[PDB]
Amino acid sequence: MRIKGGKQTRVRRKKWLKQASGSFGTRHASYKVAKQTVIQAAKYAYRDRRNKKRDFRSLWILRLNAALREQGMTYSVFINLLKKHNIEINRKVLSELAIKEPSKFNLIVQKVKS
Amino acid sequence: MHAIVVCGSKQYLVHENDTFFVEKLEAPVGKEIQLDKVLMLDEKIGAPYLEKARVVCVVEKHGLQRKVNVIKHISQKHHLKKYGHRQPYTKLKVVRFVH
Amino acid sequence: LNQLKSVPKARNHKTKTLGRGHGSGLGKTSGRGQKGQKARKSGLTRPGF
Amino acid sequence: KTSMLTKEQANKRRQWYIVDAAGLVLGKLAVKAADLIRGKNKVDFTPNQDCGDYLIIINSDQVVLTGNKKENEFWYHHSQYIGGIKKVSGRDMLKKQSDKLVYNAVKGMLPDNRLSRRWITKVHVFKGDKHNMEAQKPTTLNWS
Amino acid sequence: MIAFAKQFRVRISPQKARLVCQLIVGKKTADAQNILSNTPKKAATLIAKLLNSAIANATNNHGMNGDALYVFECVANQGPSMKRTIPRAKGSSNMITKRSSNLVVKLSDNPNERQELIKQQKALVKKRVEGQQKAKMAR
RNA sequence: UUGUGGUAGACGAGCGUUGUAUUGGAGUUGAAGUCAAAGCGUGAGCAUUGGUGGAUCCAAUACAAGUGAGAAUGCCGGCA
RNA sequence: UUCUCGCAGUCAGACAGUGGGGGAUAAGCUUCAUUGUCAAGAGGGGAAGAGCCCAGAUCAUUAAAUAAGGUCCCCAAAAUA
RNA sequence: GCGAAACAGUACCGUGAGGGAAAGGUGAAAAGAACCCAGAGAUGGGAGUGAAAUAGAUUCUGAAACCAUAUGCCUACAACGUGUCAGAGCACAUUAAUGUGUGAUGGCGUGCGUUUUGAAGUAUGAGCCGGCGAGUUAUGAUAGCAAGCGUUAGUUAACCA
Ligand SMILES: [Mg+2]
Numbered sequence: 029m030r031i032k033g034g035k036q037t038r039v040r041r042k043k044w045l046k047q048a049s050g051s052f053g054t055r056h057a058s059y060k061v062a063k064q065t066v067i068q069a070a071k072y073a074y075r076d077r078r079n080k081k082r083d084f085r086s087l088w089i090l091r092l093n094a095a096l097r098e099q100g101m102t103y104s105v106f107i108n109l110l111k112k113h114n115i116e117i118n119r120k121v122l123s124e125l126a127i128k129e130p131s132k133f134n135l136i137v138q139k140v141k142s
Numbered sequence: 143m144h145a146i147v148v149c150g151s152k153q154y155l156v157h158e159n160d161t162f163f164v165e166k167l168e169a170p171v172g173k174e175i176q177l178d179k180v181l182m183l184d185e186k187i188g189a190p191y192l193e194k195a196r197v198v199c200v201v202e203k204h205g206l207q208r209k210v211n212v213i214k215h216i217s218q219k220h221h222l223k224k225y226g227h228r229q230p231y232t233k234l235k236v237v238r239f240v241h
Numbered sequence: 242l243n244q245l246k247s248v249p250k251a252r253n254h255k256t257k258t259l260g261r262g263h264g265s266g267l268g269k270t271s272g273r274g275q276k277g278q279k280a281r282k283s284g285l286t287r288p289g290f
Numbered sequence: 291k292t293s294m295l296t297k298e299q300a301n302k303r304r305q306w307y308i309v310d311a312a313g314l315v316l317g318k319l320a321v322k323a324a325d326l327i328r329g330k331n332k333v334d335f336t337p338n339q340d341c342g343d344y345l346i347i348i349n350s351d352q353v354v355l356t357g358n359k360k361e362n363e364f365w366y367h368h369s370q371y372i373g374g375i376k377k378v379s380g381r382d383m384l385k386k387q388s389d390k391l392v393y394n395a396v397k398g399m400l401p402d403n404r405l406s407r408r409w410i411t412k413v414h415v416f417k418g419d420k421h422n423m424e425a426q427k428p429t430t431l432n433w434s
Numbered sequence: 435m436i437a438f439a440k441q442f443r444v445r446i447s448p449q450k451a452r453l454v455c456q457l458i459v460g461k462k463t464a465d466a467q468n469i470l471s472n473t474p475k476k477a478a479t480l481i482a483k484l485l486n487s488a489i490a491n492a493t494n495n496h497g498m499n500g501d502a503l504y505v506f507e508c509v510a511n512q513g514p515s516m517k518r519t520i521p522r523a524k525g526s527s528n529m530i531t532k533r534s535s536n537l538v539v540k541l542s543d544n545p546n547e548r549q550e551l552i553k554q555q556k557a558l559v560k561k562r563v564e565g566q567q568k569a570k571m572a573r
Numbered sequence: 574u575u576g577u578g579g580u581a582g583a584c585g586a587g588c589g590u591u592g593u594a595u596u597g598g599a600g601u602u603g604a605a606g607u608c609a610a611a612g613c614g615u616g617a618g619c620a621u622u623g624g625u626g627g628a629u630c631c632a633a634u635a636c637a638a639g640u641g642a643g644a645a646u647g648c649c650g651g652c653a
Numbered sequence: 654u655u656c657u658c659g660c661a662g663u664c665a666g667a668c669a670g671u672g673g674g675g676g677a678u679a680a681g682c683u684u685c686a687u688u689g690u691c692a693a694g695a696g697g698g699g700a701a702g703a704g705c706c707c708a709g710a711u712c713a714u715u716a717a718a719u720a721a722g723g724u725c726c727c728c729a730a731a732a733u734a
Numbered sequence: 735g736c737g738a739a740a741c742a743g744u745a746c747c748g749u750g751a752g753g754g755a756a757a758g759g760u761g762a763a764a765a766g767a768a769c770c771c772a773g774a775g776a777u778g779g780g781a782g783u784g785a786a787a788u789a790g791a792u793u794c795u796g797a798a799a800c801c802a803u804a805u806g807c808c809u810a811c812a813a814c815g816u817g818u819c820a821g822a823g824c825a826c827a828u829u830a831a832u833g834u835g836u837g838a839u840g841g842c843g844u845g846c847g848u849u850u851u852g853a854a855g856u857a858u859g860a861g862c863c864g865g866c867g868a869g870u871u872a873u874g875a876u877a878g879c880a881a882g883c884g885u886u887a888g889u890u891a892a893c894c895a
């Protein structure tokens with residue numbers, strides 16, 4: 029018994045090529061390059077799915093530092109004024125968003141002054 | 143007006159009539175769930191949590207997020223393992239918040 | 242006993258196919274190691290040796 | 291999952307400024323200028339929209355460098371040729387070209403980036419008190 | 435309302451025919467026949483005849499207006515090739531490949547004629563989604 | 574409750590292909606194959622609709638193998 | 654990690670700390686005993702580094718506290734004396 | 735699959751012994767496309783036959799690499815293993831989905847197999863696509879698992895019907 033099987037190979041390569049669309053040049057045409065680029069893209073996806081929560085926290089810190097620097101104290105002093113006194117688990121983003129709807133944030137920053 | 147609520151493990155800034163997506167809650171469509179934990183309801187800041195304060199939401203749907211197809215591949219060392227993931231979520235909106 | 246569904250109890254064991262990729266294991270080297278005398282065709286010198 | 295963080299986009303509004311760099315020092319002025327240009331101090335800093343303000347620096351030649359640097363630290367500039375090192379000293383930079391000094395000291399503090407070359411053009415360093423940018427109605431603040 | 439005309443396996447290159455086909459495309463027919471006759475190219479004596487034949491096909495067969503015509507869309511697709519051997523120093527026998535071109539010229543009558551192709555494109559997906567939806571009634 | 578990085582390498586459970594057997598069954602009211610699409614799976618892989626095409630084919634359980642390709646200055650054909 | 658049975662693979666190692674030989678208290682040198690790491694191992698520090706320091710990745714989260722290292726700007730984070 | 739489905743040991747290479755290929759399918763049936771227009775003509779476009787002429791003699795189907803055309807979006811101060819995570823504006827509207835195509839701009843980012851102590855590698859292999867292509871078989875040995883049969887057990891080979 030002889031088995032040729034050109035169906036399965038083409039279907040597999042078609043899936044790999046379909047994965048990489050919107051790629052420059054031949055990367056979406058030739059399969060040999062498409063597989064390399066899909067592998068590399070998924071590596072980058074795995075690394076960035078961690079780097080982005082590494083970075084968004086930093087952005088929230090930055091936009092909280094800026095808001096507090098216009099009241100007379102720094103972010104590195106505000107965190108004490110949440111943990112030790114008036115123990116609060118308000119998150120590190122929402123205290124950021126509260127500036128985009130301000131004058132409810134000022135209530136926070138003057139509440140810890142007690 | 144606003145409120146800050148701990149649903150799942152993420153804290154949410156939530157007003158009236160807003161739809162937000164949280165992690166799976168094990169509750170069928172249409173029922174009302176009272177999220178219990180809450181901090182900073184309205185100018186009223188509970189230090190550990192705001193006691194005797196809830197936010198009442200109606201669950202809209204259970205869904206699966208977009209597929210994340212993770213392939214990990216040691217370079218030039220005989221390894222091409224592949225795995226896929228569809229994190230389930232629940233979308234739900236608020237009706238009003240218990241004072 | 243319904244030849245349309247004929248089943249045994251247990252005899253169909255893991256067939257180590259040696260050269261069909263890595264996911265099954267036993268792939269490119271095929272269990273022969275790396276680059277020795279045994280790696281080449283017809284290794285395994287005389288039994289008592 | 292969670293509520294997506296808010297991020298302004300083409301919602302930028304930028305107000306001019308004026309600082310009279312009479313007796314400040316180079317670097318302490320430069321970090322403040324760099325932050326004011328980047329809009330790092332804005333309450334809503336979107337990292338990719340040039341949300342920062344404009345800036346005009348006046349009386350450049352009066353800025354001061356601490357210590358004996360005026361005779362010991364050199365600024366270099368090289369053409370792509372050979373033997374093209376142009377090497378000038380702090381005393382000569384505070385006289386011949388002073389605005390270029392503050393300009394360069396500010397530019398290097400910005401990231402290697404594609405808005406950095408578009409940020410830096412928001413810094414206008416006039417050498418003397420007079421200017422032609424009174425039309426834009428700047429504010430005025432001390433030591434920034 | 436297109437009335438094309440095609441010549442197959444002309445002994446010209448595809449890449450030399452595309453140079454004058456660019457000249458003729460998008461322009462009116464009165465300033466195409468003459469502008470193509472007057473240019474000094476081998477790829478012009480081979481396209482003047484074809485363009486005039488397309489004119490005649492449009493005018494006689496389909497019955498269009500004529501002085502409203504314009505060259506809708508011009509190409510020189512790759513026709514079949516010929517393979518030949520060429521001697522060399524020391525007998526190395528490179529392969530010369532003679533080219534060819536399947537020229538085709540389309541002559542439209544209404545000035546737009548392009549949104550109609552897009553309309554057919556959109557219908558071909560509208561019917562796909564519609565057949566998809568009518569088969570969602572599997573309950 | 575304790576765990577879940579991993580080459581060589583040991584072990585386990587599996588997908589797919591071609592055909593035979595019996596069992597069901599779809600097909601000119603359009604079969605396989607082929608492209609396209611904004612689906613479903615933990616993976617190998619699997620459906621749905623439409624255009625083309627113009628006669629064979631799909632699922633369940635066993636069985637048997639020329640059974641699974643990105644690399645061999647690989648072979649053949651085509652094309653840059 | 655002891656005993657029996659089936660099945661292999663391996664026998665070109667490298668560097669850092671420590672104690673010595675050869676070497677010239679020369680080598681990213683060579684040969685050993687030892688502790689690690691890499692190999693076969695990603696992340697953070699180190700500007701950039703396979704082998705140093707911290708650590709040991711089931712997958713998703715636009716959650717919180719930390720280790721080495723670090724807080725004028727690039728680059729997240731500090732002030733007083 | 736015989737080297738060979740056809741005028742193959744042909745054509746072709748070689749002084750000679752000898753070496754030695756490739757390619758098939760209209761349709762049910764030629765009803766092989768009279769006639770008209772352009773053109774020198776092949777041919778093409780209508781007509782005509784026919785179920786279909788995107789079946790037309792280039793003749794079953796007709797992927798990919800490859801070459802051209804076109805709606806939609808971006809790009810002419812920009813350092814780029816070319817993608818990813820964020821993200822504007824723009825244009826559409828689906829296997830109804832926290833949707834689709836492009837993606838100004840920020841952060842981040844030295845390919846795949848091989849062999850090596852260690853390679854992005856100034857070490858090597860691959861121009862690209864498709865197809866072909868590499869642990870099987872006979873007869874015995876030992877081990878594991880399952881089954882039949884069992885304590886004077888078990889078991890056939892050749893051969894014959
Ligand atoms: Mg090898």
Ligand SMILES: [Mg+2]
Pocket residue numbers: 269
């Ligand atoms: Mg391989």
Ligand SMILES: [Mg+2]
Pocket residue numbers: none
């Ligand atoms: Mg070489």
